[PDB]
């Protein structure tokens, strides 16, 4: 399955996943493609924050669906 | 600061025995009794709460209807409100170990919050942290510095805060056991701003984990807003309001700011895409 991840920098990242994949799985994939630790990523679908131990099947995230990514960098 | 003397001046001359059971009331309706009424004149009474008040909290003085004038009863209750928060400017917190601005900013937000008294009596909170917040206004510069170093070490020793290096202000809030209202968990909103506008009426601290991220200009209800954190990406800064005046606290550096400044703070750093405001404190 294909999803899109838009960031607040005006940057879209496309990933290939499956409805069985956990939210942590999506973050580790994001950590590889762009280097953001999951500790400091927030993923949003339909205004709602995606919890780590859940699947994309739970949030009704189909193909075509696009997530919003918010970086929470340490300070 | 939390057991003050209150005096009310009535327009007409009031007969004694006319004035009723005066009480202060907290935001949730809880009534605290007052002591004996001192008559400074025939139109000036003075009293003080028996029991100490909560810090950083609004109280309502009610003179119940029926105050008899020398001429005449009172048709409606006479109502006035004040706040126990300090009005002196806030204090800086030096960035001691080089990577504690997230701890400093979080403490700054906690000491300005209505959860302060609950933090101070929570035994699960490290006592060195409760010590520092207790005398934040009164401590000397050298005592505040030593208390800050003790509070940083106690915090870094909990499971929630990284033992060294930078962090996020949320992690310190979890160590303080400060309950935050998550905007994304709301029943009646799909964004940060509407989740705050429609929160339960007793809600005073918010964790903005919805979308879109909010600038200061987008924060609802500016009248009752008293504190919020600001992230640039790899640095933290606290904004706190005292006596109607906003202060920017960059660790040890306190400075007054204008409303014009705050309406220019962006909702995130367009360079690194990091969110800026995640904790919002109301009174």
Curated annotation (Swiss-Prot), chain A:
There is a cross-link at residues 6, 11, 27, 29, 33, 48, 63 (Glycyl lysine isopeptide (Lys-Gly) (interchain with G-Cter in ubiquitin)). The record marks 68 as: Essential for function. Changing residue 74 to G: No effect on ADP-ribosylation. Changing residue 72 to K: No effect on ADP-ribosylation. It comes from the Eukaryota. Changing residue 65 to D: Phosphomimetic mutant that binds and activates PRKN. Residues 1-75 form the Ubiquitin-like domain. Changing residue 54 to D: Decreases affinity for UBE2R2 in CRL2(FEM1C)-UBE2R2 complex. Changing residue 65 to A: Prevents phosphorylation in case of mitophagy. Decreased localization of PRKN to mitochondria. Changing residue 65 to E: Phosphomimetic mutant that binds and activates PRKN. Changing residue 63 to R: Abolishes HLTF-mediated polyubiquitination of PCNA. The modification (Microbial infection) ADP-ribosylthreonine is found at residue 66. The modification Phosphoserine is found at residue 65. Disulfide bonds: none annotated. It is found in: Cytoplasm; Nucleus; Mitochondrion outer membrane. Phosphorylated at Ser-65 by PINK1 during mitophagy. Phosphorylated ubiquitin specifically binds and activates parkin (PRKN), triggering mitophagy. Phosphorylation does not affect E1-mediated E2 charging of ubiquitin but affects discharging of E2 enzymes to form polyubiquitin chains. It also affects deubiquitination by deubiquitinase enzymes such as USP30. It is a peripheral membrane protein. Exists either covalently attached to another protein, or free (unanchored). When covalently bound, it is conjugated to target proteins via an isopeptide bond either as a monomer (monoubiquitin), a polymer linked via different Lys residues of the ubiquitin (polyubiquitin chains) or a linear polymer linked via the initiator Met of the ubiquitin (linear polyubiquitin chains). This is Ubiquitin. The gene is UBC.
